[PDB]
Amino acid sequence: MASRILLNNGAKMPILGLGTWKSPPGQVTEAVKVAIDVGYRHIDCAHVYQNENEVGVAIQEKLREQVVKREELFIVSKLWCTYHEKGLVKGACQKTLSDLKLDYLDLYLIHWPTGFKPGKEFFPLDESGNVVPSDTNILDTWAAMEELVDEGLVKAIGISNFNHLQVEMILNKPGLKYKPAVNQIECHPYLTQEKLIQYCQSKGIVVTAYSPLGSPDRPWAKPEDPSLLEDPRIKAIAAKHNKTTAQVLIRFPMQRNLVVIPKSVTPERIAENFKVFDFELSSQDMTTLLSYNRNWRVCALLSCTSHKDYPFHEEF
Numbered sequence: 001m002a003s004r005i006l007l008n009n010g011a012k013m014p015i016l017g018l019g020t021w022k023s024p025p026g027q028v029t030e031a032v033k034v035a036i037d038v039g040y041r042h043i044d045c046a047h048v049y050q051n052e053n054e055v056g057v058a059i060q061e062k063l064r065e066q067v068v069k070r071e072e073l074f075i076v077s078k079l080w081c082t083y084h085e086k087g088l089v090k091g092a093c094q095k096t097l098s099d100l101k102l103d104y105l106d107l108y109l110i111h112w113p114t115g116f117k118p119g120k121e122f123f124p125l126d127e128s129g130n131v132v133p134s135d136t137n138i139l140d141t142w143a144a145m146e147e148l149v150d151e152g153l154v155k156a157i158g159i160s161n162f163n164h165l166q167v168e169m170i171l172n173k174p175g176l177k178y179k180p181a182v183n184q185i186e187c188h189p190y191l192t193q194e195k196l197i198q199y200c201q202s203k204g205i206v207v208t209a210y211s212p213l214g215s216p217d218r219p220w221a222k223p224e225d226p227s228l229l230e231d232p233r234i235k236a237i238a239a240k241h242n243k244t245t246a247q248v249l250i251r252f253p254m255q256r257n258l259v260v261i262p263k264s265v266t267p268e269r270i271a272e273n274f275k276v277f278d279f280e281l282s283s284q285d286m287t288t289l290l291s292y293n294r295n296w297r298v299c300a301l302l303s304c305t306s307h308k309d310y311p312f313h314e315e316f
Protein backbone atom coordinates (compact mmCIF):
# COMPACT_ATOMS: atom_id res chain seq x y z
CA MET A 1 0.00 0.00 0.00
CA ALA A 2 1.40 3.29 -1.21
CA SER A 3 1.88 5.92 1.46
CA ARG A 4 0.40 8.93 -0.38
CA ILE A 5 -2.68 9.71 -2.53
CA LEU A 6 -2.69 12.21 -5.36
CA LEU A 7 -4.96 15.23 -4.90
CA ASN A 8 -6.68 17.26 -7.62
CA ASN A 9 -4.21 20.11 -6.97
CA GLY A 10 -1.32 17.89 -8.09
CA ALA A 11 0.13 17.40 -4.60
CA LYS A 12 0.45 14.09 -2.75
CA MET A 13 -1.17 13.60 0.66
CA PRO A 14 -0.07 10.93 3.21
CA ILE A 15 -2.93 8.48 3.73
CA LEU A 16 -2.13 8.17 7.49
CA GLY A 17 -2.16 11.22 9.72
CA LEU A 18 -2.23 12.01 13.44
CA GLY A 19 -5.41 13.50 14.85
CA THR A 20 -5.19 16.18 17.57
CA TRP A 21 -8.74 16.90 18.80
CA LYS A 22 -8.77 16.42 22.60
CA SER A 23 -4.99 16.03 22.78
CA PRO A 24 -4.12 17.96 25.95
CA PRO A 25 -1.84 20.92 25.42
CA GLY A 26 0.68 19.50 27.90
CA GLN A 27 0.75 16.17 26.00
CA VAL A 28 0.36 17.03 22.31
CA THR A 29 3.88 18.43 21.76
CA GLU A 30 5.37 15.06 22.76
CA ALA A 31 2.68 13.20 20.80
CA VAL A 32 3.54 15.03 17.56
CA LYS A 33 7.30 14.68 18.17
CA VAL A 34 6.91 10.92 18.67
CA ALA A 35 4.62 10.67 15.66
CA ILE A 36 7.17 12.34 13.37
CA ASP A 37 9.97 10.19 14.83
CA VAL A 38 8.10 6.95 14.03
CA GLY A 39 7.08 7.98 10.52
CA TYR A 40 3.98 10.19 10.49
CA ARG A 41 4.16 12.97 7.92
CA HIS A 42 0.59 14.28 8.17
CA ILE A 43 -0.91 16.07 11.20
CA ASP A 44 -4.62 17.03 11.37
CA CYS A 45 -5.15 20.28 13.29
CA ALA A 46 -7.81 22.90 13.93
CA HIS A 47 -8.09 26.27 15.62
CA VAL A 48 -11.14 25.09 17.64
CA TYR A 49 -8.98 22.36 19.23
CA GLN A 50 -7.14 25.10 21.22
CA ASN A 51 -3.78 23.33 20.93
CA GLU A 52 -2.23 24.55 17.66
CA ASN A 53 0.56 26.47 19.45
CA GLU A 54 1.70 23.26 21.15
CA VAL A 55 1.39 21.21 17.94
CA GLY A 56 3.51 23.89 16.27
CA VAL A 57 6.26 23.61 18.93
CA ALA A 58 6.67 19.96 17.95
CA ILE A 59 6.67 20.59 14.20
CA GLN A 60 9.22 23.37 14.56
CA GLU A 61 11.52 21.30 16.75
CA LYS A 62 11.51 18.42 14.26
CA LEU A 63 12.22 20.81 11.37
CA ARG A 64 15.02 22.48 13.34
CA GLU A 65 16.38 19.01 14.35
CA GLN A 66 16.34 18.07 10.56
CA VAL A 67 14.33 14.99 11.39
CA VAL A 68 12.15 15.98 8.42
CA LYS A 69 12.05 18.65 5.77
CA ARG A 70 9.03 20.98 5.46
CA GLU A 71 8.29 19.64 1.98
CA GLU A 72 7.89 16.13 3.44
CA LEU A 73 5.24 17.23 6.01
CA PHE A 74 1.57 17.57 5.16
CA ILE A 75 -0.06 19.90 7.72
CA VAL A 76 -3.84 20.31 7.70
CA SER A 77 -5.93 22.85 9.58
CA LYS A 78 -9.47 24.15 9.46
CA LEU A 79 -11.47 27.39 9.44
CA TRP A 80 -13.88 27.52 12.39
CA CYS A 81 -17.56 28.35 11.97
CA THR A 82 -17.24 31.84 13.57
CA TYR A 83 -14.84 32.92 10.76
CA HIS A 84 -17.07 32.33 7.65
CA GLU A 85 -17.08 36.09 6.96
CA LYS A 86 -14.94 36.76 3.85
CA GLY A 87 -12.96 39.53 5.81
CA LEU A 88 -12.12 37.20 8.74
CA VAL A 89 -10.92 34.16 6.64
CA LYS A 90 -7.38 35.46 6.01
CA GLY A 91 -6.82 36.44 9.64
CA ALA A 92 -8.08 33.06 10.84
CA CYS A 93 -5.68 31.31 8.46
CA GLN A 94 -2.80 33.56 9.51
CA LYS A 95 -3.43 32.96 13.24
CA THR A 96 -3.32 29.21 12.60
CA LEU A 97 -0.09 29.64 10.58
CA SER A 98 1.45 31.72 13.35
CA ASP A 99 0.45 29.16 16.02
CA LEU A 100 1.70 26.22 13.95
CA LYS A 101 5.04 28.05 13.17
CA LEU A 102 4.41 27.65 9.45
CA ASP A 103 4.48 29.89 6.35
CA TYR A 104 1.93 27.74 4.52
CA LEU A 105 -0.56 24.95 5.14
CA ASP A 106 -0.71 21.92 2.88
CA LEU A 107 -4.49 21.82 3.21
CA TYR A 108 -7.00 24.21 4.82
CA LEU A 109 -10.61 22.99 5.27
CA ILE A 110 -13.91 24.69 5.95
CA HIS A 111 -14.54 22.83 9.23
CA TRP A 112 -18.36 22.75 8.83
CA PRO A 113 -20.79 24.16 6.25
CA THR A 114 -22.50 26.12 9.08
CA GLY A 115 -21.40 29.71 9.70
CA PHE A 116 -21.87 31.19 13.19
CA LYS A 117 -21.93 34.78 14.46
CA PRO A 118 -18.35 36.02 14.80
CA GLY A 119 -16.94 36.84 18.25
CA LYS A 120 -14.90 35.34 21.04
CA GLU A 121 -17.19 32.34 21.67
CA PHE A 122 -16.83 29.33 19.37
CA PHE A 123 -20.53 28.42 19.87
CA PRO A 124 -22.28 31.79 20.33
CA LEU A 125 -25.66 31.28 21.93
CA ASP A 126 -29.01 33.00 22.07
CA GLU A 127 -30.64 33.50 25.51
CA SER A 128 -32.78 30.49 24.83
CA GLY A 129 -29.94 28.10 23.86
CA ASN A 130 -29.57 27.77 19.95
CA VAL A 131 -26.48 28.58 17.76
CA VAL A 132 -26.58 32.05 16.43
CA PRO A 133 -25.95 31.75 12.66
CA SER A 134 -24.11 34.01 10.27
CA ASP A 135 -25.69 35.13 7.05
CA THR A 136 -22.56 34.54 4.92
CA ASN A 137 -23.22 32.31 1.98
CA ILE A 138 -20.88 29.34 1.97
CA LEU A 139 -20.12 29.92 -1.76
CA ASP A 140 -18.73 33.26 -0.53
CA THR A 141 -16.68 31.48 2.13
CA TRP A 142 -15.35 29.20 -0.67
CA ALA A 143 -14.25 32.26 -2.69
CA ALA A 144 -12.40 33.49 0.38
CA MET A 145 -10.69 30.08 0.63
CA GLU A 146 -9.65 30.33 -3.05
CA GLU A 147 -7.98 33.67 -2.30
CA LEU A 148 -5.75 31.93 0.27
CA VAL A 149 -4.38 29.67 -2.48
CA ASP A 150 -3.74 32.72 -4.65
CA GLU A 151 -1.88 34.44 -1.79
CA GLY A 152 0.42 31.50 -1.10
CA LEU A 153 -0.90 30.80 2.40
CA VAL A 154 -2.28 27.34 1.59
CA LYS A 155 -1.43 24.76 -1.10
CA ALA A 156 -4.87 23.13 -1.18
CA ILE A 157 -8.35 23.91 0.07
CA GLY A 158 -11.21 21.62 1.00
CA ILE A 159 -14.29 21.01 3.07
CA SER A 160 -15.41 18.96 6.06
CA ASN A 161 -18.79 17.63 7.16
CA PHE A 162 -20.37 18.63 3.82
CA ASN A 163 -23.25 16.44 2.60
CA HIS A 164 -23.44 15.57 -1.06
CA LEU A 165 -25.83 18.41 -1.91
CA GLN A 166 -23.39 20.84 -0.26
CA VAL A 167 -20.43 19.36 -2.14
CA GLU A 168 -22.51 19.72 -5.32
CA MET A 169 -23.23 23.37 -4.55
CA ILE A 170 -19.50 24.09 -4.39
CA LEU A 171 -18.86 22.10 -7.58
CA ASN A 172 -21.65 24.07 -9.29
CA LYS A 173 -20.49 27.45 -7.92
CA PRO A 174 -20.59 30.13 -10.65
CA GLY A 175 -17.04 31.05 -11.46
CA LEU A 176 -15.49 28.21 -9.40
CA LYS A 177 -11.71 28.62 -9.49
CA TYR A 178 -10.46 25.66 -7.43
CA LYS A 179 -12.36 22.46 -6.71
CA PRO A 180 -12.24 21.16 -3.15
CA ALA A 181 -9.34 18.75 -2.83
CA VAL A 182 -10.72 16.85 0.19
CA ASN A 183 -13.96 16.29 2.05
CA GLN A 184 -13.12 15.21 5.66
CA ILE A 185 -16.05 13.24 7.14
CA GLU A 186 -16.72 10.80 9.95
CA CYS A 187 -16.22 7.22 8.74
CA HIS A 188 -15.82 3.86 10.45
CA PRO A 189 -17.61 0.44 10.42
CA TYR A 190 -20.65 1.89 12.22
CA LEU A 191 -20.94 4.85 9.75
CA THR A 192 -19.62 3.50 6.48
CA GLN A 193 -20.63 6.42 4.24
CA GLU A 194 -20.90 4.46 1.02
CA LYS A 195 -23.16 6.93 -0.80
CA LEU A 196 -21.23 10.09 0.11
CA ILE A 197 -17.80 8.51 -0.51
CA GLN A 198 -18.77 7.27 -3.99
CA TYR A 199 -20.07 10.74 -4.86
CA CYS A 200 -16.89 12.48 -3.73
CA GLN A 201 -14.52 9.98 -5.34
CA SER A 202 -16.38 10.14 -8.70
CA LYS A 203 -15.74 13.90 -8.58
CA GLY A 204 -12.04 13.43 -7.88
CA ILE A 205 -12.36 14.69 -4.28
CA VAL A 206 -10.32 12.67 -1.77
CA VAL A 207 -12.15 11.63 1.39
CA THR A 208 -10.50 11.72 4.82
CA ALA A 209 -12.06 9.50 7.50
CA TYR A 210 -12.23 11.06 10.96
CA SER A 211 -13.04 9.32 14.27
CA PRO A 212 -11.91 6.00 12.70
CA LEU A 213 -11.69 4.31 16.11
CA GLY A 214 -15.13 5.63 17.15
CA SER A 215 -13.67 8.40 19.33
CA PRO A 216 -13.80 6.61 22.70
CA ASP A 217 -12.65 9.86 24.41
CA ARG A 218 -15.47 11.95 22.92
CA PRO A 219 -16.84 13.99 25.87
CA TRP A 220 -20.44 12.83 25.44
CA ALA A 221 -19.68 9.08 25.41
CA LYS A 222 -22.19 6.91 27.30
CA PRO A 223 -22.00 3.36 28.59
CA GLU A 224 -24.63 1.94 26.18
CA ASP A 225 -23.13 3.37 22.97
CA PRO A 226 -21.62 0.81 20.53
CA SER A 227 -17.80 0.42 20.82
CA LEU A 228 -15.72 -0.45 17.75
CA LEU A 229 -12.60 -1.26 19.64
CA GLU A 230 -14.52 -3.74 21.85
CA ASP A 231 -16.70 -5.28 19.11
CA PRO A 232 -15.97 -9.02 19.17
CA ARG A 233 -16.54 -9.29 15.42
CA ILE A 234 -13.78 -6.75 14.70
CA LYS A 235 -11.46 -8.21 17.29
CA ALA A 236 -11.91 -11.60 15.47
CA ILE A 237 -10.72 -10.11 12.17
CA ALA A 238 -7.80 -8.52 14.04
CA ALA A 239 -6.88 -11.83 15.68
CA LYS A 240 -6.92 -13.65 12.32
CA HIS A 241 -4.43 -11.13 10.94
CA ASN A 242 -2.25 -11.00 14.12
CA LYS A 243 -2.97 -7.23 14.43
CA THR A 244 -4.75 -5.07 16.97
CA THR A 245 -8.36 -3.98 16.58
CA ALA A 246 -7.15 -0.38 16.12
CA GLN A 247 -4.81 -1.51 13.31
CA VAL A 248 -7.75 -3.16 11.51
CA LEU A 249 -9.86 -0.02 11.99
CA ILE A 250 -7.07 2.09 10.45
CA ARG A 251 -6.34 -0.29 7.54
CA PHE A 252 -10.06 -0.48 6.65
CA PRO A 253 -10.40 3.09 5.28
CA MET A 254 -6.95 2.87 3.66
CA GLN A 255 -8.23 0.03 1.44
CA ARG A 256 -11.26 2.17 0.40
CA ASN A 257 -8.85 4.83 -1.05
CA LEU A 258 -9.43 7.06 1.97
CA VAL A 259 -7.05 9.05 4.11
CA VAL A 260 -7.40 8.27 7.86
CA ILE A 261 -6.42 10.33 10.93
CA PRO A 262 -6.51 8.35 14.22
CA LYS A 263 -5.80 10.42 17.35
CA SER A 264 -3.55 9.35 20.21
CA VAL A 265 -1.38 10.96 22.86
CA THR A 266 0.00 7.59 24.00
CA PRO A 267 3.48 6.97 22.54
CA GLU A 268 3.04 3.22 22.20
CA ARG A 269 -0.34 3.61 20.43
CA ILE A 270 1.04 6.32 18.12
CA ALA A 271 3.70 3.84 16.98
CA GLU A 272 1.05 0.98 16.86
CA ASN A 273 -1.34 2.91 14.67
CA PHE A 274 1.40 3.51 12.09
CA LYS A 275 2.25 -0.23 11.54
CA VAL A 276 -0.56 -0.76 9.10
CA PHE A 277 1.34 -0.92 5.81
CA ASP A 278 2.39 -4.60 6.19
CA PHE A 279 -0.91 -6.53 5.99
CA GLU A 280 -4.00 -6.69 3.81
CA LEU A 281 -7.67 -7.17 4.61
CA SER A 282 -9.38 -9.48 2.12
CA SER A 283 -12.36 -8.32 0.06
CA GLN A 284 -14.47 -10.58 2.30
CA ASP A 285 -13.02 -8.83 5.39
CA MET A 286 -13.80 -5.44 3.84
CA THR A 287 -17.39 -6.38 2.97
CA THR A 288 -17.82 -7.89 6.45
CA LEU A 289 -16.63 -4.63 8.10
CA LEU A 290 -18.93 -2.62 5.83
CA SER A 291 -21.82 -4.81 6.97
CA TYR A 292 -21.55 -3.35 10.49
CA ASN A 293 -22.95 0.02 9.40
CA ARG A 294 -25.46 1.39 11.99
CA ASN A 295 -25.62 5.15 10.80
CA TRP A 296 -24.06 5.92 14.17
CA ARG A 297 -22.35 9.29 14.48
CA VAL A 298 -19.69 10.50 17.01
CA CYS A 299 -19.99 14.05 15.77
CA ALA A 300 -23.52 15.34 15.11
CA LEU A 301 -23.02 19.04 16.16
CA LEU A 302 -26.23 18.73 18.09
CA SER A 303 -26.55 22.43 19.09
CA CYS A 304 -26.85 23.32 15.36
CA THR A 305 -29.63 21.13 14.12
CA SER A 306 -31.78 24.14 13.01
CA HIS A 307 -28.99 25.87 11.17
CA LYS A 308 -30.03 26.26 7.59
CA ASP A 309 -26.83 24.47 6.56
CA TYR A 310 -26.84 21.72 9.14
CA PRO A 311 -25.44 18.82 7.13
CA PHE A 312 -27.01 15.69 8.63
CA HIS A 313 -30.73 15.94 7.89
CA GLU A 314 -30.04 14.87 4.29
CA GLU A 315 -29.62 11.14 3.76
CA PHE A 316 -26.07 11.76 2.59
Ligand SMILES: NC(=O)c1ccc[n+]([C@@H]2O[C@H](COP(=O)([O-])OP(=O)(O)OC[C@H]3O[C@@H](n4cnc5c(N)ncnc54)[C@H](OP(=O)(O)O)[C@@H]3O)[C@@H](O)[C@H]2O)c1
Pocket residue numbers: 018019020021022044045111160161184185209210211212213214215216217229244246247261262263264265266269270272273298299
Ligand atom coordinates in the same frame (compact mmCIF):
# COMPACT_ATOMS: atom_id res chain seq x y z
N1 LIG B 1 -13.53 17.51 10.79
C1 LIG B 1 -14.21 17.25 11.92
O1 LIG B 1 -15.31 17.74 12.20
C2 LIG B 1 -13.58 16.26 12.86
C3 LIG B 1 -14.41 15.64 13.83
C4 LIG B 1 -13.85 14.65 14.63
C5 LIG B 1 -12.54 14.30 14.51
N2 LIG B 1 -11.72 14.98 13.60
C6 LIG B 1 -10.26 14.66 13.51
O2 LIG B 1 -10.12 13.25 13.50
C7 LIG B 1 -9.25 12.87 14.59
C8 LIG B 1 -9.57 11.47 15.05
O3 LIG B 1 -10.91 11.40 15.59
P1 LIG B 1 -11.21 11.38 17.17
O4 LIG B 1 -10.16 12.14 17.91
O5 LIG B 1 -12.63 11.82 17.31
O6 LIG B 1 -11.17 9.85 17.61
P2 LIG B 1 -10.41 8.48 17.20
O7 LIG B 1 -9.15 8.78 16.49
O8 LIG B 1 -11.45 7.61 16.58
O9 LIG B 1 -10.19 7.87 18.66
C9 LIG B 1 -9.25 8.53 19.57
C10 LIG B 1 -9.29 7.73 20.87
O10 LIG B 1 -8.82 6.38 20.60
C11 LIG B 1 -7.75 6.08 21.53
N3 LIG B 1 -6.81 5.23 20.83
C12 LIG B 1 -5.95 5.61 19.83
N4 LIG B 1 -5.21 4.60 19.37
C13 LIG B 1 -5.61 3.54 20.11
C14 LIG B 1 -5.17 2.20 20.09
N5 LIG B 1 -4.19 1.76 19.29
N6 LIG B 1 -5.77 1.38 20.98
C15 LIG B 1 -6.74 1.81 21.80
N7 LIG B 1 -7.24 3.06 21.88
C16 LIG B 1 -6.61 3.91 21.01
C17 LIG B 1 -7.20 7.42 21.98
O11 LIG B 1 -6.60 7.29 23.26
P3 LIG B 1 -5.22 8.04 23.70
O12 LIG B 1 -5.16 9.34 22.96
O13 LIG B 1 -5.43 8.16 25.20
O14 LIG B 1 -4.11 7.08 23.34
C18 LIG B 1 -8.46 8.29 22.01
O15 LIG B 1 -9.18 8.07 23.23
C19 LIG B 1 -9.43 13.99 15.60
O16 LIG B 1 -8.47 14.01 16.62
C20 LIG B 1 -9.42 15.19 14.68
O17 LIG B 1 -8.07 15.44 14.30
C21 LIG B 1 -12.26 15.92 12.80
Ligand SMILES: NC(=O)[C@@H]1C[C@]2(NC(=O)NC2=O)c2cc(F)ccc2O1
Pocket residue numbers: 021048049050111298299300301302
Ligand atom coordinates in the same frame (compact mmCIF):
# COMPACT_ATOMS: atom_id res chain seq x y z
N1 LIG C 1 -20.23 18.36 18.54
C1 LIG C 1 -19.56 18.15 17.38
O1 LIG C 1 -19.97 17.41 16.48
C2 LIG C 1 -18.21 18.85 17.24
C3 LIG C 1 -17.09 17.86 16.99
C4 LIG C 1 -15.72 18.58 16.95
N2 LIG C 1 -14.61 17.63 16.84
C5 LIG C 1 -13.78 17.95 15.82
O2 LIG C 1 -12.70 17.43 15.59
N3 LIG C 1 -14.35 18.96 15.06
C6 LIG C 1 -15.51 19.36 15.63
O3 LIG C 1 -16.26 20.22 15.23
C7 LIG C 1 -15.58 19.55 18.10
C8 LIG C 1 -14.34 20.03 18.49
C9 LIG C 1 -14.27 20.98 19.46
F1 LIG C 1 -13.03 21.43 19.83
C10 LIG C 1 -15.36 21.52 20.06
C11 LIG C 1 -16.59 21.05 19.67
C12 LIG C 1 -16.73 20.05 18.71
O4 LIG C 1 -17.99 19.62 18.43
Ligand SMILES: [Cl-]
Pocket residue numbers: 046047048049078079080081111
Ligand atom coordinates in the same frame (compact mmCIF):
# COMPACT_ATOMS: atom_id res chain seq x y z
CL1 LIG D 1 -11.27 25.12 13.44
